Symmetry: C2
Subunit: 118 residues, 2 copies
């Protein structure tokens, strides 16, 4: 079946790029990065802000469906921050992708997991 | 190696917010906070936050010397906002967002603080 439509960078700065669908210009994904020295008791924190926007017809006006993720941790521990992102997705999936959290309701019995293993 | 991710237990609860933590490492938390609102659509904003206290790397010769390093805070927050009416497409947007973040962060260099302007970013729409 079909490939996903490619998006093109429309604004491009060292620290922030905005991609949009050239045939649906309201569809956007942007990435903005902030690197900062932090003393922990000497690391370089990177805070990455990732934002997806889609304009969706109400079943007439469009609503803004938006997803904003911020990932924040030292570059030095980027290996484990990757594992944190994996587990974050998995835990979000549990509630929203295959649960009812997108309807506004939490499942108290959801199997939420750490990045650590037994 | 192990695929047995440690289970986390709800420690605080409200109708709109649960915090889960690892009972063997209580500083590891995952929280889900949801707000539903009539606005005619029923908007839902869900905020999902992951926290780990991660030892900074030991310097050269640190293991030998028995150094225990202080922890940093590794945090990931996602906020998903859209009407319950279009939840199905909102789920498709979540799959796509994960994909686009993976391109830059999971297998790119965005976690080092640098963007690849040639990265293959895609819409949830198909051709």
């Amino acid at each position: 079946s079909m490939a996903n439509k490619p998006m093109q960078p429309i604004t491009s700065t060292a620290n922030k790029i905005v991609w949009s669908d050239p045939t649906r210009l309201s569809t956007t994904f942007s990435a903005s990065l902030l690197r900062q020295r932090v003393k922990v008791g000497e690391l370089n924190n990177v805070s990455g802000q990732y934002v997806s926007v889609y304009k969706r017809p109400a079943p007439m006006p469009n609503e803004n469906q938006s997803i904003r993720t911020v990932i924040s941790g030292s570059a030095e521990n980027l290996a484990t921050l990757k594992a944190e992102w994996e587990t974050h997705k998995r835990n979000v999936d549990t509630l929203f992708a295959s649960g009812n959290a997108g309807l506004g309701f939490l499942d108290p019995t959801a199997a939420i997991v750490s990045s650590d293993t037994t």
